[PDB]
Design a protein around this nucleic acid. Structure first.
Ligand SMILES: CC(C)C[C@H](N)C(=O)O
Ligand SMILES: CC(C)C[C@H](N)C(=O)O
Ligand SMILES: [Mn+2]
Lengths: 254, 262, 261, 261
DNA sequence: TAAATTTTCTGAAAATTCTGAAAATTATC
DNA sequence: GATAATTTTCAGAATTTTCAGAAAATTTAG
């Protein structure tokens, strides 16, 4: 019982202290207290984290790990489990152990634990071990981590959607204020500007498309105001441009 | 089994976390909803306070003093002494007796609950002390598994507090940054024109004649239009042309008039 | 047994010609198709949505529960039974009477002990559009009956998908039209439309435009120009009654929405 | 043989989901539907319209190379064969080589003496929408094969009917818009519209509206208001270029037609 | 026919988008 | 610093735009 409390404290410090799929590292944390390999999948099937703590046989695993994508079939199979399942044998297709070697670990047992945020399935955790099976304390720890990770996923996803919605509203609000010639100039300049940042000469392109140089300057200022870009004058070397809002080039090409 | 009951209790709290997040609600005692569940699952009285003492949730399921204690619940503020006493403990301290000053039971009525037991758990949402949970029970003691469950509840509540504060901080800072970024793109004459225009408007919205102000401050009429357009781009204002009646303006960003006068 | 199957599939194909011509005021569109399917299968047939809203039915056999007749009248199946059948991914046939997915009343479970039931789900794109329920006294469903059942299931599924896609696209096009209209009104014109249709307080009627214009401090001609810009986009239908005022009729239903927004 | 038939019908039902869209700007949209049908029946399959336009095909087996390839490339079957199959009215199967309705080339008839072919007509709302043609060497079509063939036939028939209904409805909406808009312009506004779009001499461009207004003795406000009435109905897209005039773009293609009328 | 409205057409003050010269800016040598 | 090549600020005008305002034109009841 004391060790259980210690493990819960270990995980509390660990997890609490764009992350580029952090959960992989987080999986290691979950493994340590349970001394087992861990896998984490989303509701769509996209792999979001894994840790091969024990002596695995690489192969498709090495790749599914490298490619950051689990086999579509197994991931779409676990999504319907609804509630927790424990001590699943090796002969079952729901096993975490690679089937390439089922004779190597017949004693292995595996577990599936679903993740739920605000009442919707956010993902699933998978654990696997040998010799002794998962008892209740291990399930307590598993669901502890499940709920914590559920809330972290919900937080990151809500923040990301809010960010993209604000950025898209900004882009639309800005483009709806540009004039005809200003919009043509924006198209021309950002078509010449290969990439999100660089340097170019605005007056030359302005002469190439038949628009007065001041109109282009004013357009770039209307964009700077709404934070879509950040312009800086290089004098005789031209103007330097950097795109801050990422939803801009898409709505422009559209 | 002790472990079986523990697992069942953790599941009972998980199911409420799923549907009762109530993330839209930011009303007085947001977590009190969270407090009720914890009081029931432990079959004990529960209180939730901030590091300063502001009450955020409570449940007097069992027999309480009420006469002198109800004043704290109604005013939603615990006594400064007890809160500053719980602030001294770094880590969890459980099965505290009544003779200790850390007791959750009333000092008015101490002989009514001679065997009463109480537990105190500090809260650290972001590795920083945000508050503390207080539990109180009669005779039945706290074993190890219940401590696991208590710290479970502490950790869950931490992130809800973290979000409640983070959203507003980011929102207000975003509002101020928008105005700063917009004003930093106007030229000297354009900025002077904005100052003149919004001092002449004297309101959150209204109507005026831009050409008149332009002639009054010695700036070309087109510069005012262009400046208001630079503001429209950033969603700071909403301008509408009324032709012979002038221009209509509406201030969307509330941090704008403030950043101008300063 | 196979020739009769082909004949029945052809008999269902033949009726699609006349059934495609539909009237929304019938309140029971697929009912015709339900009768057809009941007839070739000599069985009770029901068609429900994913939520339980009834879309078609036929009482070949006796239900002996005035409680079920009401279900037909109210055009709503019990939410519990619908939520039980909604979980079925694929077709299930020859369902006994003891099962809760049975179409028979719980009053009469021993009254029709041999009764069998079949459930066929309807799908389109990646979502469930509804469900078909078949029920029989003693006689069982064989494989050929299931072939015919799924034939009808697919036909009705795609007809439902088309009707709903048509409705959705129509209303979204109408809403884009309204937005395009308000984006051309001026400040005073937009305020004027608000005033007039708030004073109209209905879907159609008659009023005096000059009075309202004077009441809100706007020139009378501005009202005319705004309402004409609305008529141009087919959003309304205005006609001048001279000294009796103007008559207005709202054609586009998505208009009041863009105003209230 | 009934279970096997049910299995085949279930796999094709599973395939109906995949399409999951209706823009379908493809050269031979039903070609996908043809491929599936070709595989399950292990026979060559062709899908043509009532006029002969090819809509989908799969040449699994040997067919003439030179002249028959032009039918696939040009996407048009010979007028004689199409008008011969349009007369069939009902399904006919196991058609020998001596019949003119044969799917095999008449150049190479001595290569495939036993080849058989089947024709299935497509019907929407009592109208022939097209025809499916199937061809096998030696092996014949049984009753279950016809059940499956007509199963696919009805699906493709309703898909054709839906796409065609959408095309007609779109053009009718476009035609109604121009008349509904022009019926709201006044005399002077109509004169201005005529003058401006005769001056534009094209589908899009730039001009000076005030100049034209003075040139025909009409107030500039009339032109602005008329172009606003047109913008409201999405007939055009105007944008102000200030000192450079007004920019115009014609969205509705039936507009210039109704003006020249 | 006459009141009682609704449309049409004219006028004018203002707003707006664009050209183009004078002034500030950065950079190279 | 000196000079070239840009960027930016600033003044201006042709045009567009919106609204106000009096005829005309239009129904309805008479
Ligand atoms: C279709 C339903 C009315 C049947 C169900 N067994 C009931 O009696 O409620
Ligand atoms: C092309 C075939 C489908 C028709 C006909 N048998 C011919 O050879 O032209
Ligand atoms: Mn006049």
């Amino acid at each position: 019982m004391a060790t259980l409390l210690e493990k819960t404290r270990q995980v509390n410090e660990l997890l609490q202290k764009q992350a580029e799929l952090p959960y992989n590292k987080m999986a290691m944390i979950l493994g340590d207290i349970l001394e087992s390999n861990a896998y984490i999948i989303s509701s769509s099937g996209d792999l979001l984290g894994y840790t091969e703590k024990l002596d695995v046989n690489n192969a498709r695993i090495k790749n599914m790990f490298k490619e950051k994508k689990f086999p579509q079939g197994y991931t779409e199979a676990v999504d319907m489990l609804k509630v927790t399942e424990a001590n699943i044998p090796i002969d079952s297709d729901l096993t975490a152990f690679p089937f390439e070697s089922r004779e190597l670990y017949p004693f292995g047992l595996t577990t599936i634990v679903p993740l739920y945020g605000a009442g919707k399935r956010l993902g699933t955790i998978i654990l696997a071990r040998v010799e002794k099976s998962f008892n209740e304390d291990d399930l307590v720890l598993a669901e502890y981590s499940a709920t914590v990770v559920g809330m972290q996923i919900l937080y990151h996803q809500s923040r990301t959607i809010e960010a993209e919605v604000r950025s898209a509203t900004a882009v639309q609000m800005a483009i709806n204020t540009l004039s005809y010639s200003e919009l043509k100039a924006v198209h021309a300049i950002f078509e010449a500007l290969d990439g999100e940042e660089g340097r170019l000469t605005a007056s030359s392109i302005a002469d190439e498309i038949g628009i007065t140089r001041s109109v282009i300057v004013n357009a770039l200022r209307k964009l700077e105001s709404a934070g879509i870009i950040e312009s800086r004058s290089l004098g005789m070397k031209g103007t330097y441009l950097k795109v801050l809002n990422q939803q801009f080039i898409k709505e422009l090409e559209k």
